[PDB]
């Protein structure tokens, strides 16, 4: 079990060695936060 768990954690780590990239930042024009520089998930509102 210690082999299979740790080899999953290596598969957890190396799957996750990416570079965080800023997409685009719009102002929240609506009233929900009223002007906060929201992450603009443009084409995918199902993740916003």
């Amino acid at each position: 079990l210690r082999s299979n768990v740790l080899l999953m954690l290596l598969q957890f780590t190396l799957s996750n060695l990416k570079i965080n990239k800023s997409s685009t930042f719009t102002s929240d024009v609506t009233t929900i936060t009223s002007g906060r520089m929201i992450r603009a998930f443009e084409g995918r509102p199902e993740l916003l």
Binding site: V29, T30, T31, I32
Partner: protein, 48 residues
């Protein structure tokens, strides 16, 4: 005749409906139409 709601808009666009005084009308559908178009994006002009 239960609840009296104050609604705080600082400044707003109004639109007004001139009625005959000889005609009875419940003014709820004039304002439920106003409520039916409020989203967090915007507010339609207030039906006085």
């Amino acid at each position: 005749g239960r609840t009296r709601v104050l609604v705080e808009l600082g400044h707003y666009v109004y639109t007004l409906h001139y009625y005959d005084p000889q005609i009875s009308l419940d003014e709820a559908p004039i304002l439920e139409e106003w409520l039916s178009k409020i989203n967090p994006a915007g507010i339609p002009p207030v039906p006085f």
